[PDB]
């Protein structure tokens, strides 16, 4: 299972393994990665923006992971 804090912590630490089950999680849950559950309640930022703000030497593998997930889900 996943929630906003878990995804944010994963992308912050560049943990591509932790998000391996995000695609089947969302597909079984029938809910989009862009849904208001994943947006910040105040700023409106999504997990992608959180990943973009945490880059290591200009690289963060979880960005391509998230983009692939969002492509595949809806």
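^ Assign residues to that structure.
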């Amino acid at each position: 299972l996943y929630d906003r804090r878990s995804i944010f912590d994963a992308v912050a630490q560049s943990n591509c393994q932790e998000l391996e089950s995000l695609l089947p999680f969302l597909q079984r849950s029938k809910k989009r990665l862009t849904d208001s559950e994943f947006k910040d309640p105040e700023t409106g930022k999504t997990c992608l923006l959180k990943a973009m703000l945490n880059l290591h030497n200009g690289q963060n593998d979880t960005i391509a992971l998230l983009l692939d997930v969002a492509r595949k889900t809806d």
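DSSP finds four helices and no strands in the chain.
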